[PDB]
């Protein structure tokens, strides 16, 4: 029986993940409902991407286009890129500077906070000698602005959420994972070094798994003191660890680290924060169906970086991204795993390294972060 019928998870615990957890579109739509559109903070960008008032950057949450714009007061608004009249996705550029949002189908104008400021022909058109058209006078702009999202900005990073009753960002991450978040985003002003983008034909969860997988780097990436910590709900995680042209390494330790040499922090479900040697990046997951996701790397540095340090970060970025000596393996194996899952969706994986227990460890020889991820997955999705 290769294709499932009324599937049920193989028992309790999470030491065996069924293949259909990656191949079912109904499960994926429920994932969009419960992990991206409710009860979660999802990454929308960096403050440096929108330094001045009016600066906006288009991005995504789950599969919903949103706009992150800097308000004239200095705050950050996040609105849904869908108009109130007839649902047109009106914002087409990736970035720019606008005093207001506007949809040109019928030229509805909204403030930078999403408030409907103008509707052409709202009170009608008097011609000779009649007033024609107009909106029904019960309709007022207060109720037909852009869907607004709540915003959490911290350390230079910007998250947002459709759910307005979501726990505060700090309580969302928990103390231990928030320590490493702040460890990279330590209050300095960041400078954007650039973007890389890749479309990976696998289930989005496989990327979280890949950055919740601590012992694959020593076995997969042939271009090569650890501890793994989690938040209360096992959703977020932190992995802590201590050639012809010498410039291709030229690794110089940095004081702000300040003792772990590498930390890979997965903030569920939307983002990875990478600190590897001297390269520092965010990795944004943007799902597209159950079997594909886009992956956007924002590589950045700090303002106190001189030009030598900028060159250091840039050259070491050659190890990561869609072409890196290390990172291409990840997309490749994620695609191949998805092919395997689709091949026999009734089967199951075995994530049993380090036992079946879920908890923070002081070694890297365990799949406990994935076991915790799928404990949380079963709880949130009722599977």
């Amino acid at each position: 029986p290769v294709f499932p019928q009324d599937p049920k998870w193989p028992g309790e615990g999470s030491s065996r993940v069924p293949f259909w957890a990656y191949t079912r579109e109904d499960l994926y739509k429920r994932e969009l409902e419960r992990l991206f559109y409710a009860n979660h903070w999802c990454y929308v960008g960096l403050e440096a991407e929108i330094p001045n008032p009016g600066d906006f950057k288009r991005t995504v949450i789950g599969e919903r286009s949103v706009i992150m714009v800097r308000d004239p007061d200095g705050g950050i608004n996040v609105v849904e890129n869908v108009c109130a009249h007839r649902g047109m996705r009106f914002c087409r550029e990736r970035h720019g500077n606008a005093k207001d949002f506007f949809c040109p189908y019928h030229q509805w104008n909204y403030s930078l906070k999403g408030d409907l400021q103008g509707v052409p022909f709202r009170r009608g058109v008097k011609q000779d000698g009649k007033v024609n058209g107009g909106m029904p006078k019960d309709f007022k702009l207060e109720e037909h602005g852009l869907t607004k999202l709540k915003v959490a900005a911290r350390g230079g990073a910007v998250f947002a959420s459709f759910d307005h009753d979501v726990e505060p960002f700090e309580e969302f991450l928990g103390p231990t994972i928030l320590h490493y978040f702040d460890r990279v985003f330590n209050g300095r002003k960041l400078k954007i070094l650039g973007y890389r983008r890749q479309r990976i034909p696998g289930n989005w969860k496989l990327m979280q798994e890949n950055i919740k997988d601590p012992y694959h780097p020593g076995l997969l990436h042939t271009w090569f003191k650890s501890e793994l910590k989690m938040d209360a709900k096992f959703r977020h995680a932190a992995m802590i660890s201590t050639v012809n042209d010498p410039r291709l390494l030229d690794i110089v330790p940095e004081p702000w680290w300040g003792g772990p040499t590498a930390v890979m922090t997965t903030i569920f479900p939307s983002v990875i924060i990478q600190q590897q040697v001297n390269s520092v990046s965010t990795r944004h997951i943007q799902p597209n169906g159950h079997g594909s996701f886009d992956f956007v790397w924002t590589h950045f540095g700090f303002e106190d970086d001189n030009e030598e340090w900028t060159q250091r970060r840039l050259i070491q970025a050659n190890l990561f991204g869609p072409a890196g000596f290390v990172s291409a393996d990840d997309g490749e194996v994620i695609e191949w795993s998805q092919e395997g899952f689709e091949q026999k969706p009734t089967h199951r994986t075995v994530i049993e390294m380090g036992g079946h227990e879920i908890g923070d460890t002081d070694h890297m020889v365990t799949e406990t972060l994935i076991r915790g991820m799928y404990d949380y997955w079963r709880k949130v999705m009722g599977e």
Binding site: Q198, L220, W223, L248, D294, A317, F325
Partner: protein, 161 residues
């Protein structure tokens, strides 16, 4: 601006680069560069906005050799055919110093990928921006910049563009 012999050698250089990086002899990729030559593969969005990040920045022929070795021996990747379609090149300038002459030239390119039993797709499209110098071995690249439109990379770029 260039005489017929140089123009012939230049079109041959573009074609040689394209066809060698599509063949089983792609490891000869560094031979198109002088020892101080550079190779940059950069998204259009970074380039147009003055953002210095590339998809790949090999700042010496030695780093290019590094990349060749890494690709050939240290990277697990889906094997694939690639086919460079390089449009008609254009010669923009010829300049002169005590090292000799430099020729600046451009050419649009389309890299077509074929996974083993798959359709042929537009993997990576953009243009070359080259400074070309003459060595005893023929025309060689002093610097090659590939500004590519295909920012949404189809999962991975392994072989030379």
């Amino acid at each position: 601006m260039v005489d017929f012999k140089t123009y012939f050698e230049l079109l041959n250089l573009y074609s040689d680069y394209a066809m060698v990086c599509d063949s089983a002899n792609w490891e000869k990729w560094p031979d198109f560069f002088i020892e101080t030559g550079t190779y940059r593969l950069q998204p259009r969005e970074n380039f147009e906005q003055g953002l210095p990040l590339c998809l790949l920045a090999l700042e010496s022929k030695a780093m290019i050799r590094d990349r060749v070795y890494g690709v050939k021996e240290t990277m697990y990747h889906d094997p694939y055919y690639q086919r460079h379609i390089v449009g008609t090149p254009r010669v923009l300038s010829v300049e002169r110093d005590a090292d000799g002459e430099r020729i600046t030239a451009e050419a649009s390119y389309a890299v077509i990928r074929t996974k083993y039993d798959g359709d042929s797709t537009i993997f990576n499209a953009g243009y070359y921006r080259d400074v070309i110098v003459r060595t005893p071995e023929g025309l060689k690249l002093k610097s090659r910049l590939c500004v590519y439109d295909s920012e949404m990379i189809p999962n991975s770029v392994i072989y030379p563009i």
